[PDB]
């Protein structure tokens, strides 16, 4: 019998590492179905904000206009998605954009040659002014009521150092990109995670004792922190299983072709969530759980 | 098309949540069938996959000029040693998990980078 | 022609890394693997993206239709 209590008694979380960008925790005694559901919801259905509808006034740059629009829409934005709501479809496109769900990112740049251009200067950082357009140049501007709401939030790209376009003197860019809420399953630019994946904990079943120099090489097959030599009795024991990446270098040697089995525990996942800069991986996982729960709840309460 | 005559039309844009994934956490961007290899007999594609993974892992570039090897120094062994020194499988196989069933696949999947 | 904002296979941003990679490679005797390690790229999906970018926009810019040559 499986019950909610019989699952709560055995399930556990071991947050091995944490950071504002990358988490690495463990889900134990949970089903591969639910762990995979969390992973997929996390990588696709967790909302985020990225520019969608660009507006271009001039683009004399070498970069094609649509290529620049794609690059601009790609860049992550250090915006909490919960600060702005969702956009409409049936509403007129002149009126679908409110001050509660849209972020405007102007970018006005004009490359001009540096009059004090040194002789023998090859690096363009001296020969031209504003030759390189960086994502820092995307300058958020408040609209309507945004002044008294997003004041403390310095809306900037989650990376201000991503390169947008390389210019030449005379060439100009002048655009305004509207940002809205979206999800990863729609377009890969809304995915709030650089990655989100797990792996079952490797299992190393040593059947016959490995003693002497044989255990010394048997340890060298695995990563350095996986197998250890016992102090007193010269042997091999599994020191840290998580540290092992399953490469099966042992199986290439016949002396270990019958002394070890490389199994794998089927209920012990090792998640690793890297935020794209928009949020933090602990909150990404929290919202993945909340999305799965709200999805099951909406299915439950939806009339049949 | 690969650089070994392995042409083929794209048949579906497979969503990344449905793509298979590995322990490292990468969905391959190109999926090709293994059954294209027996009749077509292109071991060059396999060794290019091996060399590409090894080169991207070690940060280096792989030469592929014909007849630099012999039957005593197999490119399979060469790029396998360079993968074992990097920590991956000597035979190029990456243990993948299916992005739909969540379960690990029956055996380790041959993955790599190719042009 | 110009460095992509996001790595194709995963999504790890490699577009804020091209100048850093070039500087690491030219200022010191850093090999490409070491530079890609120090730049935050440990999976080969990210590593090849900056190991194998051509930056053809340099050759592209040298034909300016708005400058005397």
């Amino acid at each position: 019998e499986w019950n909610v209590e019989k699952f709560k008694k055995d399930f556990e979380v071991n947050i091995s590492s944490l950071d504002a960008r990358e988490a690495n925790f463990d889900l134990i005694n949970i089903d591969t179905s639910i762990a995979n559901a969390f992973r997929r919801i996390m990588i696709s259905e967790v909302p985020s904000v990225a520019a969608e509808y660009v507006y271009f006034f001039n683009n004399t740059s070498v970069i094609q206009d649509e290529v620049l629009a794609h690059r601009i829409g790609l860049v992550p934005l250090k915006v909490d998605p919960d600060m702005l709501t969702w956009v409409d479809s049936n509403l007129p496109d002149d009126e679908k954009f409110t001050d509660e769900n849209t972020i405007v990112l102007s970018l006005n740049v004009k490359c001009t040659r540096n009059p004090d251009a040194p002789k023998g200067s090859t690096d363009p950082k001296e020969l031209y002014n504003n030759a390189h357009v960086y994502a820092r140049d995307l300058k958020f501007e408040p609209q309507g009521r945004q002044s008294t709401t997003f004041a403390d939030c310095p809306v900037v790209p989650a990376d201000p150092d991503i390169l947008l376009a390389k210019l030449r003197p005379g060439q100009e860019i002048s655009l305004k990109a509207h940002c809205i809420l979206g999800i990863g399953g729609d377009h890969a630019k809304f995915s709030p995670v650089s990655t989100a994946s797990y792996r079952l904990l490797p299992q190393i079943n040593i059947l016959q004792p490995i003693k002497g120099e044989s255990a010394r090489r048997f340890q060298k097959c695995f990563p350095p922190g996986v197998i250890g030599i016992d102090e007193g009795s010269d042997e091999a024991y599994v020191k840290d299983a998580r540290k092992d990446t399953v490469s099966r270098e042992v199986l290439r040697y016949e002396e270990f072709a019958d002394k070890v089995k490389l199994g794998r525990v089927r209920n012990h996942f090792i998640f690793n969530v890297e935020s794209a800069g928009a949020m933090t991986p602990e909150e990404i996982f929290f919202k993945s759980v909340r999305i799965l729960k709200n999805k099951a709840e909406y299915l439950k309460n939806c009339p049949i | 098309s690969s650089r070994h005559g392995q042409k083929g039309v794209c048949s579906r844009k497979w969503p990344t949540i449905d793509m298979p994934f590995s322990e490292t956490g990468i969905q391959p961007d190109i999926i090709i069938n293994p059954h294209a290899f027996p009749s077509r007999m292109t071991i060059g594609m396999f060794v290019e996959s091996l060399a590409g993974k090894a080169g991207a892992l070690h940060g280096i570039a792989q030469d592929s000029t014909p007849w630099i090897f012999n039957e005593d120094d197999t490119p399979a062994d060469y790029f396998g040693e360079q993968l074992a020194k990097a920590g991956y499988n000597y035979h190029g196989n990456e243990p993948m998990y299916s992005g739909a069933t969540g379960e690990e696949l029956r055996a380790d999947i041959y993955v790599g980078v190719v042009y | 022609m110009i460095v992509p904002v996001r790595c194709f296979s995963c999504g790890k941003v490699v577009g804020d890394k091209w100048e850093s990679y070039l500087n690491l490679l030219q200022e010191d005797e850093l090999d490409e693997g070491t530079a890609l390690s120090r730049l935050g790229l440990k999976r080969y999906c990210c590593r090849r993206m900056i190991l194998t970018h051509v930056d053809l926009i340099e050759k592209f810019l040298r034909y300016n239709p708005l400058e005397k040559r």
């Binding site: 091995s16 590492s17 690495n24 994946s197 792996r199 990563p223 998580r242 540290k243 092992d244 990446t245 090792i270 690793n272 | 322990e23 490292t24 956490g25 892992l57 070690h58 280096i60 630099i68 090897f69 012999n70 005593d72 120094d73 060469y78 360079q82 020194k85 990097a86 920590g87 991956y88 | 693997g33 440990k42």
Partner: peptide, 19 residues
Amino acid sequence: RKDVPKVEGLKLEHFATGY
């Protein structure tokens, strides 16, 4: 014919997640 030269000084690149 000497064999293909070996790229020496190669270290361990793949560390498990969290490592």
